[PDB]
């Protein structure tokens, strides 16, 4: 299987819109898809447990039907940091676990998103960051950068740490959190020659609802 | 002199109060001190040219009369990235000119305090960064974090990218940019753990005003 692992500027920059557009584009490709968020913080309760809407929106973005465990093992009700929360309730979060579920998405799944949580460096445990998972498996990685001021610095200091932990920077994209404003062009222009990877789309912004949004059409899969 | 880079782990993380903070301290201290903001994008009109508020505050904290284009060399009106603007004006931001203004003032002060713009990657020309221009000077860098979910990953990715570039973290700010949240304990523990540099206090949260609060004794400048 194909494998990418998805990684923000910063936590609520789009990452799982970006994530439902790149899970659109495989699947028109004629990939059989599964999305996986191995872990999740700020969930809802309900009849069947704890679930989390990102985690819900790349299970119905996955061409496959999966049950919600098998995208997302682990699941915390409060939006933070995820070692507070796992400290919290006595649940540990398990890179054995995290490594598996990553498998068994494998054994039906021939394009497999991992999208992560928060920003590059979210710590899981005291002693283990999320940084530590994706380097030990090895996976390339996608940059989503929400286009705002302020975003040069936060796109340059993640693509030179991945870099540095001798992983592969497969593309990056280019997310409109804000409506069009005075200096898109050359925030684009800039971002283009800055990050050493290759720029996989733009997508516009979407004011209503934009994960369930037919956004496929705004990534060239092509080169990845 | 002794001299500092204040960085901030994004735009608009407090970094102006925490070096008014700083300036405040070492003036109680006993030195001469000096603010320099040498690229300065968002000013206002007035009778003398453009005048950024930033700069304004780092002037009337300084314990020396200084005169504005002292303190801030290049003063643009557009609240944008400064490479953007000052190709836009046609008027480059020189490197020999922000090293001279930094001389200058150590004519005079013993205690220099040297705030960028924006975060560690501002770009100031196609070719040339704020970074750049740091490690050229080999300027000891504190770093100013904004305390809300997303900092660890800033806070971790800017300290990593300063050591790689062989340069000195000399301690970190805490700043309190919201009101008592619930994890705030557990985020400042992390952040203690995580960044490879003293704490050298933490700014509360001051709603009215806080660059004309007097900050000075959040700051253990003993630890610098
Ligand atoms: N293209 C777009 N147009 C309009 N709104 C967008 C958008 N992309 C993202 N948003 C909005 O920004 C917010 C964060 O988006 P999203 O949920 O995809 O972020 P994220 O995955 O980075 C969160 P976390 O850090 O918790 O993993 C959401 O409310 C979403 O609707
Ligand atoms: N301790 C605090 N309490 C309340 N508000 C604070 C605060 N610290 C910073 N702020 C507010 O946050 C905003 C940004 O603060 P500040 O001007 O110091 O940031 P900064 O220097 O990072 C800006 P730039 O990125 O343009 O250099 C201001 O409106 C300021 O009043
Ligand atoms: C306009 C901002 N407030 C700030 C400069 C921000 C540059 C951000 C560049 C980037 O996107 O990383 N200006 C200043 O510090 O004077
Ligand atoms: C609660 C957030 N929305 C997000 C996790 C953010 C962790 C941020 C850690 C940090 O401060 O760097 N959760 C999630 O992606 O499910």
């Given at each position: 299987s194909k494998r990418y692992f998805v990684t923000g500027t910063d936590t609520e920059v789009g990452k799982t819109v970006a994530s439902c557009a790149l899970l659109?584009?495989?699947?028109?490709?004629?990939?059989?898809?599964?999305?996986?968020?191995?872990?999740?913080?700020?969930?809802?309760?309900?009849?069947?447990?704890?679930?989390?809407?990102?985690?819900?929106?790349?299970?119905?973005?996955?061409?496959?039907?999966?049950?919600?465990?098998?995208?997302?093992?682990?699941?915390?009700?409060?939006?933070?940091?995820?070692?507070?929360?796992?400290?919290?309730?006595?649940?540990?979060?398990?890179?054995?676990?995290?490594?598996?579920?990553?498998?068994?998405?494998?054994?039906?799944?021939?394009?497999?998103?991992?999208?992560?949580?928060?920003?590059?460096?979210?710590?899981?445990?005291?002693?283990?960051?999320?940084?530590?998972?994706?380097?030990?498996?090895?996976?390339?990685?996608?940059?989503?950068?929400?286009?705002?001021?302020?975003?040069?610095?936060?796109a340059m200091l993640t693509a030179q740490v991945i870099q540095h932990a001798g992983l592969t920077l497969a593309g990056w994209v280019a997310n409109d959190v804000t409506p069009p404003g005075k200096r898109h062009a050359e925030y684009m222009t800039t971002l283009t020659r800055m990050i050493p990877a290759p720029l996989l789309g733009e997508i516009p912004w979407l004011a209503e609802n934009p994960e369930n949004a037919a956004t496929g059409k705004y990534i060239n899969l092509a080169l990845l």
């Open positions: 659109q584009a495989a699947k028109a490709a004629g990939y059989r898809t599964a999305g996986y968020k191995p872990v999740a913080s700020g969930s809802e309760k309900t009849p069947e447990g704890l679930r989390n809407s990102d985690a819900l929106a790349l299970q119905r973005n996955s061409s496959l039907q999966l049950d919600y465990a098998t995208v997302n093992p682990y699941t915390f009700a409060e939006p933070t940091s995820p070692h507070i929360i796992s400290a919290q309730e006595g649940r540990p979060i398990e890179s054995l676990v995290m490594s598996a579920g990553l498998r068994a998405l494998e054994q039906q799944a021939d394009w497999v998103l991992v999208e992560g949580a928060g920003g590059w460096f979210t710590p899981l445990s005291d002693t283990f960051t999320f940084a530590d998972w994706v380097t030990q498996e090895q996976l390339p990685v996608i940059l989503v950068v929400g286009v705002k001021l302020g975003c040069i610095n936060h």
